[PDB]
Ligand binder design. Structure first.
Ligand code: CL
Ligand code: CL
Ligand code: CL
Length: 149
């Protein structure tokens, strides 16, 4: 079984509404908020925040520069979810398919962000994407702590 799933939920100190705003409509802000990790987010087709939009990422993992081109496969505005399908880039050298779901809980009480990966490895010895999950959680912490008062 070359297919896998990885899920991590973290509670955030910042407003979930704003976190979802970023991931849906203003994804380019993550260059500014997590500049060590993300060097560019470039819309290529469509409109920010719409299903089918195509986005190019320039990022750095373990000090090495990588790229990805993603399609926004799904949006659920009620559950504050957005699903990104990776279609090209370094990850495609290891995974046949890779989907990342970001889902934000804003019940009111608290706020959390859940990151879900669904992937299929090209080979059995390909690693689980722990380093990428750590990266995503880091980005999340950079956003939540950006310009704290
Ligand atoms: Cl900006
Ligand atoms: Cl950017
Ligand atoms: Cl849409």
């Amino acid at each position: 079984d070359l297919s896998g799933k990885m899920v991590k939920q973290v509670e955030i100190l910042s407003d979930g509404i704003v976190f979802y705003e970023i991931f849906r409509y203003r994804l380019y802000l993550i260059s500014e908020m997590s500049p060590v990790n993300i060097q560019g987010v470039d819309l290529l087709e469509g409109n920010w925040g719409t299903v089918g939009s195509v986005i190019f990422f320039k990022y750095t993992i373990d000090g090495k520069e990588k790229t990805a081109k993603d399609i926004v496969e799904a949006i659920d505005e009620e559950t504050k979810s957005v699903t990104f399908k990776i279609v090209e880039g370094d990850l495609m050298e290891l995974y046949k398919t890779f989907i990342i779901i970001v889902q934000v809980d804003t019940k009111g009480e608290h706020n959390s962000v859940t990151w879900t990966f669904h992937y299929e490895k090209l080979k059995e010895d390909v690693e689980e994407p722990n380093t990428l999950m750590n990266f995503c959680i880091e980005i999340t912490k950079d956003i939540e702590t950006y310009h704290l008062k």
